[PDB]
Design a protein around this ligand. Structure first.
Ligand SMILES: Nc1ncnc2c1ncn2[C@@H]1O[C@H](COP(=O)(O)OP(=O)(O)NP(=O)(O)O)[C@@H](O)[C@H]1O
Ligand SMILES: Nc1ncnc2c1ncn2[C@@H]1O[C@H](COP(=O)(O)OP(=O)(O)NP(=O)(O)O)[C@@H](O)[C@H]1O
Ligand SMILES: Nc1ncnc2c1ncn2[C@@H]1O[C@H](COP(=O)(O)OP(=O)(O)NP(=O)(O)O)[C@@H](O)[C@H]1O
Ligand SMILES: Nc1ncnc2c1ncn2[C@@H]1O[C@H](COP(=O)(O)OP(=O)(O)NP(=O)(O)O)[C@@H](O)[C@H]1O
Ligand SMILES: NC(=[NH2+])NCCC[C@H](N)C(=O)O
Ligand SMILES: NC(=[NH2+])NCCC[C@H](N)C(=O)O
Ligand SMILES: NC(=[NH2+])NCCC[C@H](N)C(=O)O
Ligand SMILES: NC(=[NH2+])NCCC[C@H](N)C(=O)O
Ligand SMILES: [Mg+2]
Ligand SMILES: [Mg+2]
Ligand SMILES: [Mg+2]
Ligand SMILES: [Mg+2]
Lengths: 388, 390, 390, 390
């Protein structure tokens, strides 16, 4: 008996019209909106009011920027994971959105939760794996998989029919996602990989041709694998990300133009901006090269893909992830020190690093003989053979 | 009796004095010098003549640039491997040097082979693993592990006592290696990772502040994972690497400043220049992302570290490498197409790609996939009711 | 328009009633049946006649036992793969069934292919992945996912209303699959892992208490990773498997009782009989331990899970599988020799092995190896003075 | 700087007995402290202590480490599920513990050096010395087998007699053995020919299958967080449970492995290993994991078993790499809690039921899952139209 539904509400046209749609298809159902502040830099008061004006009985706005940075982005930094060796995994936000939706749903005695992810992308998997992992008893409603709205023009017609304001502004040329960690752009003319990136895509990163002609030095202090200070100033994760995004963005750093494999089974061409992320990944990699032994570094690097795939596929809320985090946290115990980097014209240039736990500071013949003994034996057995 | 020794001879003071040293410690032994042209851009006829003036009975100069490109660098490009996710592995040349040394050693019926790799580095392992893999019967002599010479001034004293001319110009401030693929710099003041790279290190790459203010477009055509044309012009591998090294180096591309783990058990700070290698790695990665399925891409990426460690450790001549190469060659069958890149201020910027084998092209399907993909998570959370994942 | 359908036909009641059901739901479609002889040891003439009596216009019976052994089981033996470290993967037959279904469909102007795998299992994924990999243009029809028949009694009602004869003998208490490599049992009272295996499950393996009191020696010759002779007699793959299944089954060998993760999201309890497979896996493992270097063995063992998952998931017809097969075939080049084993009371006991390519054959070297192998540990403990590894 | 005191890992053999006078000879006025560990080798340790004192040791410690061997070494090993090269139960996991106790006493006694009696050709010298460097990088290590002029057992006997050490006539053991609560190892002698079956005088704790009981024996194992806590309904300490299970499973002929393994020191060795309780615990642990872990956790954990096994085999126990693996493993073991019933019979460990409070064992969706799971295969086959996967 669906009497009450919690909707992950982003403020767009689509989730706005899902409020009356949900109330139409679940008779006398009350709809509560859940709005997360992830750093998308939108007017959340206006989004809250729009949810209420659209028919929600309540509209929660939850500021999750610090929780996102400390509970999601910091473990990701520690993992060093890049999906398919290229993608900075900004959709790590989806399980956090799901977590807040489920938390509020359970305090509001709702029967079902809903989200506005489309029927063709990855985000629907991320949302629904997370919801099942957190609250297997909650019904999930995905209007894009059910309703007859097929186009933006149809959504606009429906919006006007239900008193939802639709002012004229052209269709966005690109489908975008924005949080404190990244900006993603896909769709439209981007879906043709034979074409270069158009010049109106980037939103927070300067094209290299307009970057400063003087390099900028940044000094990052890390403790146990995460950054705690910038240029000698202790900063919260959010403040450090904000400052580093501004600096590295001004210097054109961090743009990735990639073709990736979706979980749903097709390839997509995406543009990703993440200036601070690129700088943090570089500094973290340098410190690990100083502070981990060879065997630890090699084993940890061999698990980056596993971690990246888990994040990409929405499997954050799993024992598998818990076990990887426990492995990673051990490896990060001594990843503590100072990394100086020069930002300049899209480049992150090493400028020195140090750590109180730096490992940088007749035997050879015996090592060589025993290291190569199996090769010597093999070649004696296969005399005259080659390795072609 | 050791009557004949083949020496891998690079032309420095050290391998020059190894010639009388070997003749002294192996009485009446004749020494044959083997010099490889790997693209180090040195006067090899001068090096040949110095080998003979130093007491070598014969001095071979073998031009192996083409074979280095096709038999080593092209498999490396196909692998996509980077040691510790950073190093472009220019010492992939060491097994080739060992291969030419052994080939000549067997032709000349020598009793032993010798090399001048130092006793503290990786190159001695690379040479000696390769020699044992190719010719386990040959004795190996490494003078740096046997002789009493410890410093350059000690080598100079020895050279004077043994009729070896000492070059006027001193040893560079850095230990360097140079071939068509890369230039490496280590040692000296580079052994302090707390300092930035000095301004006198780079030899083939412009500093980014001194790069052109206009971008340059390059177009690379690939066939089965390797580049066959640049800007619409079919080029041999060596000509293509040469051209791309010039273009990308002019635009400041490809400098790596890293701390790596040696095989011999300690970390070293190195500077690596490899402009064309960076451009080819980028283009190859882009084309794989278009032409491989997800499962093939993910499996191949998971073997890159294995390949990189094998190359770094000198294990090129092994059945393990042969098996990896067979796997890689299958995955490269359709990595064929065109990649356009912009070179600019140290950046390699995607400018479009296409492939006749590109794999890039209902709502009811998604709900079923979601439910079964997530079923195990739903069962787990029902069993551990109320549990967190903290 | 779907005018003609090829149905993978096993001869049970369910695939029999699918023939009239397909004709009802695809207006006047012709249905041809494809029956594979995989070693299920059934009366294939009776199955062929039952397909025709049920309304099939044609019923092909294809003997695929040699193709199965040489093109599927031999690569599997070479891989050493066991799904979740326990399961011998007898459903490697499903891509072969799909391959014959498609081969015949494309000689018969067929528009759609059909199979009788249930909607809850793995086999439907295996069939339909394979069909899409081989012939993406063919439509696929799975009646269990579409029709309203939900029980055996409902199937019987439907058979009676459509002229399909109902067998006198009931449904077996277990869902079974049988080919030359294995017999699988699941469902029924087996779906309680808290209970031991009932005494009426096993079909080709003696209970251990009912095995001979004298051991039996078998001698297996291998060439390039696959068995070519048994007790000094060269035997075809099918004859060797048949003989070894009889011998090892009589000695109680090869029963696995496991809980496995399905691809479709849930765990299942299965009983698997595969006597010859257990013996061949053991002999192959022993010879690899003799003929492979350490690095090759370790790398190959690290890919067994990948291969096992690929087979289990039905991804046989993929470039990923082709690349793995290329890797594996290199590693098998020297896996050639003789393994003697004692079969006794459910045990496979090594009794000696040899190979012309066996790799089994100073104190000063050890100290240097130890010091450099341990140098990284010494540096770390000097840096972290007073620490522990708790 | 002058070596005044040496701590020696002292086993009671002839070899470490004569190392006390040898050490005192080669390090003038040095005293020798013997360190004897109780690992379950079932020897008279007070007699070994007395022999050390009689041979000239100033102090002789006997450290009972059986409980901590089980809880700090064997229990993590059981939780890992690791087998070296998929065959070896890793009984030399004891070597880092021996080194740890040696180093503790070394530091307490303010000695200048530690010594051990491992030979120059084996793995144990690496295990001891890696551990010693990881725990105490400042301590000098003395390995007399790598230094002294004693080459044979007969020479060791001559030396013992010239230095007052009792050598009564008792013939050379035909095999080199190691024994602790976890396993017994046998190698050397006629075992070094893999073409020969195991001789009938090898086994010491495991019945040959032909003399095992004719009635099966049920054991019930309760596990909590991946380790056994009770046997047949009785809570037992780890040592008591291992002792009881070794007796029961040994009586039923369980757990003998006859293998060829790759040494770290670069060559293969043929070994016989007995470990009855270990085989039973490994089987029970594997069954419980199959019930309680999700598929993705099981697959990832199984993929790290080889890493863990190699680390243990190579002596790298005292490392951050091991600590990180243990942290991963411990998370996966949090719900590996429940009851496994097994039948021991004639060398077989037969599943007889399992249950757990955390067991994970309990039409339209399947089509959508199939279509998206197989979409990349369909796209690939449309691009490579009509292609094959041979
Ligand atoms: N900050 C957020 N708070 C709550 N729900 C969110 C948030 N961001 C995304 N979602 C949910 O995730 C779904 C998918 O995100 P998204 O791709 O941004 O679509 P959209 O916001 O509906 N459309 P658009 O205007 O093009 O961005 C949304 O429909 C919401 O259900
Ligand atoms: N092109 C080459 N041809 C033949 N042998 C070579 C070549 N390059 C390197 N070697 C061998 O490898 C050894 C190690 O190389 P390297 O570190 O360059 O030492 P080096 O040339 O003797 N000294 P330096 O002058 O400081 O570069 C050399 O001594 C030679 O034995
Ligand atoms: N040897 C075979 N030849 C052709 N098709 C087969 C063969 N084995 C299995 N199949 C197909 O695979 C499907 C699933 O196999 P299976 O689980 O045995 O179902 P079934 O045979 O229809 N029912 P049952 O009588 O309980 O064995 C069958 O319905 C057929 O479509
Ligand atoms: N329980 C133990 N306590 C102390 N040291 C030990 C113990 N077991 C082994 N060691 C050390 O490990 C070394 C190698 O073990 P091992 O192979 O048993 O040689 P051994 O005891 O000297 N000779 P053997 O009588 O043939 O077993 C010994 O020489 C000791 O230094
Ligand atoms: N709803 C969105 N626009 N999401 C951005 C998707 C980014 C990227 N393709 C991913 O799947 O992680
Ligand atoms: N002799 C030399 N300078 N060799 C260059 C070594 C570069 C790098 N450290 C490597 O081991 O591959
Ligand atoms: N239709 C059948 N009876 N199939 C046998 C299934 C065996 C095993 N569970 C597997 O998926 O491989
Ligand atoms: N000293 C001994 N006898 N040790 C037994 C060695 C067992 C096995 N070969 C190993 O290296 O682990
Ligand atoms: Mg949005
Ligand atoms: Mg040189
Ligand atoms: Mg059947
Ligand atoms: Mg002993």
């Amino acid at each position: 008996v669906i009497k009450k539904i919690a909707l992950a509400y982003s403020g767009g046209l689509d989730t706005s019209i899902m409020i009356p749609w949900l109330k139409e298809h679940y008779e006398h159902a009350e709809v509560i909106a859940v709005i997360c502040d992830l750093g998308q830099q939108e007017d959340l008061d206006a989004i809250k009011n729009k949810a209420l004006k659209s028919g929600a009985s309540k509209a929660y706005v939850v500021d999750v920027k610090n929780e996102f940075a400390t509970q999601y982005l910091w473990p990701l930094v520690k993992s060093g994971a890049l999906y398919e060796d290229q993608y900075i995994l900004g959709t790590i936000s989806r399980p956090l959105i799901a977590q807040k939706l489920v938390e509020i749903a359970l305090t509001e005695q709702v029967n079902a939760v809903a989200h506005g992810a489309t029927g063709k992308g990855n985000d629907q998997v991320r949302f629904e794996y997370s919801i099942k992992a957190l609250a297997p008893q909650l019904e999930i409603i995905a209007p894009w998989r059910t309703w007859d709205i097929k186009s933006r023009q149809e959504a606009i017609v429906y919006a006007k029919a239900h008193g939802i304001e639709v002012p004229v502004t052209p269709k966005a040329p690109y489908s975008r996602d924005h949080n404190i960690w990244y900006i993603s752009h896909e769709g439209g003319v981007l879906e043709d990989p034979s074409q270069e990136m158009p010049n109106d895509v980037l939103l927070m990163t300067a094209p290299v041709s307009q970057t400063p002609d003087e390099e900028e030095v940044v000094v990052l202090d890390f403790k146990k694998g995460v950054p705690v200070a910038l240029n000698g100033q202790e900063l919260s994760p959010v403040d450090l990300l904000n400052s580093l995004n501004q600096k590295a963005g001004q210097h054109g750093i961090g743009v990735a133009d990639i073709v990736e494999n979706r979980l749903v089974g097709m390839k997509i061409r995406g543009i990703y901006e993440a200036p601070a992320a690129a700088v943090l990944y570089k500094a973290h990699k340098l410190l690990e090269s100083l502070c981990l032994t060879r065997s630890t570094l090699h084993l940890k690097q061999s698990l980056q893909q596993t971690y990246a795939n888990l994040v990409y596929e929405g499997r954050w809320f799993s024992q598998t992830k818990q076990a990887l985090d426990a492995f990673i946290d051990v490896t990060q115990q001594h990843v503590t020190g100072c990394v100086k980097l020069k930002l300049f014209k899209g480049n992150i240039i090493p400028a020195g690093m140090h750590s109180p736990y730096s490992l940088h500071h007749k035997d050879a013949e015996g090592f060589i003989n025993l290291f190569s003994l199996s090769a010597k034996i093999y070649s004696q057995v296969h005399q005259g053979g080659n390795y072609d």
